[PDB]
Design a protein around this ligand. Sequence first.
Ligand SMILES: [Ca+2]
Ligand SMILES: [Ca+2]
Ligand SMILES: [Zn+2]
Ligand SMILES: [Zn+2]
Lengths: 81, 81
Amino acid sequence: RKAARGRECQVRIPGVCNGNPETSVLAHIRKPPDLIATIACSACHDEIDRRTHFVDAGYAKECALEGMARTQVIWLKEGVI
Amino acid sequence: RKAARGRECQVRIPGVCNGNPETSVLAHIRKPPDLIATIACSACHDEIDRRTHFVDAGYAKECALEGMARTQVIWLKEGVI
Ligand SMILES: [Ca+2]
Ligand SMILES: [Ca+2]
Ligand SMILES: [Zn+2]
Ligand SMILES: [Zn+2]
């Protein structure tokens, strides 16, 4: 599942997102399981982890978890899970 | 997984939650898959689905998805998934 590298960001915080799938990683939602994670570009990853705080933490969290649900939905369709 | 019946609500919107696990069901997050769902008491279920709108929709969504992550984490621990 850590092979979400090079996929589209599912977090997509406006402004913060870089939209560049080359930067995408499996970003764990806060040894946590890879299921409980979202594909996130480098920028969104730093924001959802609160290494940056460009946006409100509730909104970041909302986007992170929305991203997690989209990611799991991708895994479902693709046969990954 | 629809055997989340009688478990504790993982959504727990303050005020809205009834806290009564007898009312709990597997509430799908919006034929969607049961993975993309949370254990929710009857009250939280109606709120996250927007049948009631006691709280802000962004906050409800946040709680719903947080509930989904907690539920999946329960499924992981319990061997359900
Ligand atoms: Ca940007
Ligand atoms: Ca109550
Ligand atoms: Zn992004
Ligand atoms: Zn509840």
